[PDB]
Design a protein around this ligand. Structure first.
Ligand SMILES: CC(=O)N[C@H]1C(O[C@@H]2[C@@H](O)[C@@H](CO)O[C@@H](O)[C@@H]2O[C@@H]2O[C@@H](C)[C@@H](O)[C@@H](O)[C@@H]2O)O[C@H](CO)[C@H](O)[C@@H]1O
Ligand SMILES: CC(=O)N[C@H]1C(O[C@@H]2[C@@H](O)[C@@H](CO)O[C@@H](O)[C@@H]2O[C@@H]2O[C@@H](C)[C@@H](O)[C@@H](O)[C@@H]2O)O[C@H](CO)[C@H](O)[C@@H]1O
Lengths: 307, 307
């Protein structure tokens, strides 16, 4: 049978699958207080993409289409196009366009546009509030609060490039909320075709998150962003499409220098990782370490307690 | 021997290796008038990274470090850190930090910063002119023309996220110049440890470029950006590290729908692709097509003329 494997990449060599920035560290902690149901960075070890997960790390949280001004303000509405600038098909059995942001927050970036007639271009600071009723990606439209008006033509391809997140008012780090999904259709209807929610079932285990720090653009935003799988694991499983001979793949985080194993963890075929530990812990790892697939085990396997 | 392969990805599913944006099309054209020596997106089919090439598609043209204002202006100097925020080591035998931009142009983006003390964050529009004498990545410092002053503390981790390119004055599309390398050490010294220059040697052949359109942020900039290898081919070869049984791998671009071959091309072990054709041509390809490795051939192999 086609042998299953995980890429030979260190945490630092990989990318966050929920925002286009690199991974930074490994974090584990209880998650019973939240609803862990991210839509980006979801894929079976089998290579089956779930939720809004697509293959490009650079296309996460980006939007394309044309815009129309909202006279009397600095806001604009973007009628979404498919990532390759074609018509957007709402009919697809997906929660929203692949790559759409999967958390409630205010993403700040820039809108860039080119007038097809003369090669005339322009850019403007922009922010998208995914919790806004006007955040309707699934219906094909999103709204941005801009730094201007006047300069942004209609019927012209416009792109939004994400940079980071902002935060307002007291009660610091109150937003964004990485674990609260936005309403892809807004008020028009509930979310559909979602990747299931995730939770560690086996006693004594906690989810292992692949963490990054989204850049802050204003205020005191909660910049922690945890994904369940590095973007290159998604890309790799999709390429390999190796059959799961069990529902849990045993992985060992090894140090290529000392040649020794630091800890071991469970890679669930559904596409998420758990470790044996209780409490919030920032994993201390040798920069050159990487994950290695050792073997398929049953779901009743008890992992050696993580460091 | 470990069998060589190329990923099963369509052009649209892949990323440009010279700017963090997705690929868009395939372009071929004469290149004798220029010096094709890009430093990003360079890797042997063997898996040996060359030039300033690193594995993350999202880390291309990004910079990290801290800044100090240039009193009397809206400009700032950033003392560069390594991508993981550690000290930058100029001693490495590389042209510049991995991922540094490899063309002369004005890249516009945003600088983002967080005050480690309170979780205070801020962002500002910024532009880096790689042709500027102050563009000294190799020495560990770069300079940005900002939209402000006052708001940007020192001794605080600051990041630059690229968005697109700008252009000034008449003579439209005069800049940027994707084929002119910047001086990583500025005036202090010539470039070093460069990936070699590339040129089609075999008669009747032209380089095959993997093209994207960088977003324009002002003026009439030349937005064409050609890389020699998609970023995922770099990532793939690096993973596989398959030995080259010859110096040229024969590839066929196939349509998974019709099951038929569109054209064939040469993937040089040095890391670049050539096709049999003369003149500028935007390749017309079925959106689902992808490259497939068929076999190693000698360097005297004559390719069937590209469509
Ligand atoms: C956009 C702007 O005006 N920036 C100024 C500035 O402004 C800020 C504004 O967004 C108000 C709204 O209530 O909130 C402040 O928090 C925000 O400042 C930003 O966040 C704080 C936490 C710090 O990180 C600031 O450095 C950051 O800009 O005022 C400051 C000085 O008072 C600057 O002029 C800044 O460019
Ligand atoms: C930054 C700014 O002031 N933007 C304005 C604007 O300004 C432009 C400025 O950068 C001058 C400098 O000589 O060059 C212009 O080219 C640039 O305009 C920009 O490029 C042109 C080719 C068009 O694509 C413009 O839409 C684009 O902004 O003036 C315009 C109206 O005159 C707007 O107010 C814009 O926000």
């Amino acid at each position: 049978t086609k042998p299953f494997t995980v890429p030979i990449l260190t945490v630092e060599e990989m990318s966050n699958s929920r925002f286009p920035i690199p991974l930074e560290k490994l974090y584990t902690g209880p998650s019973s207080a939240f609803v862990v149901q991210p839509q980006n960075g979801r894929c079976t070890t089998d290579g089956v993409l779930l939720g809004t997960t697509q293959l490009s790390a650079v296309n996460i949280c980006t939007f394309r289409g044309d815009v129309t001004h909202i006279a009397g303000s600095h806001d604009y509405i973007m009628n979404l196009a498919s990532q390759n600038w074609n018509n957007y098909d709402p009919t697809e059995e997906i929660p929203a366009p692949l790559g759409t942001p999967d958390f409630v927050g205010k993403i700040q970036g820039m809108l860039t546009q080119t007038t097809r007639e003369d090669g005339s271009t322009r850019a403007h600071k922009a922010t998208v509030s995914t919790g806004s009723v006007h955040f309707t990606p699934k219906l094909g439209s999103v709204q941005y609060t801009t730094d201007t008006n006047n300069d942004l033509q209609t019927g012209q391809n416009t792109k939004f490039t994400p940079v980071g997140v902002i935060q307002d008012g007291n009660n610091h780090q109150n937003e964004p909320q990485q674990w609260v999904l936005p309403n892809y259709s807004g008020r028009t209807g509930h979310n559909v075709h979602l990747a299931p929610a995730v939770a560690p079932t086996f006693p004594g285990e906690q989810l292992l998150f692949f963490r990054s720090t989204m850049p802050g653009c204003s205020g005191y935003p909660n910049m922690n962003l945890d994904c369940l799988l590095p973007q290159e694991w998604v890309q790799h499983f999709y390429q390999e499409a190796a059959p799961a001979q069990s529902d849990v793949a045993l992985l060992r985080f090894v140090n290529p220098d000392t040649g020794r194993v630091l800890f071991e963890c469970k890679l669930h075929k559904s596409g998420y990782v758990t470790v044996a530990h209780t409490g919030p812990h920032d994993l201390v790892i040798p920069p050159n370490g990487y994950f290695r697939f050792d073997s398929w085990v049953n779901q009743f396997y008890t992992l050696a307690p993580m460091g």
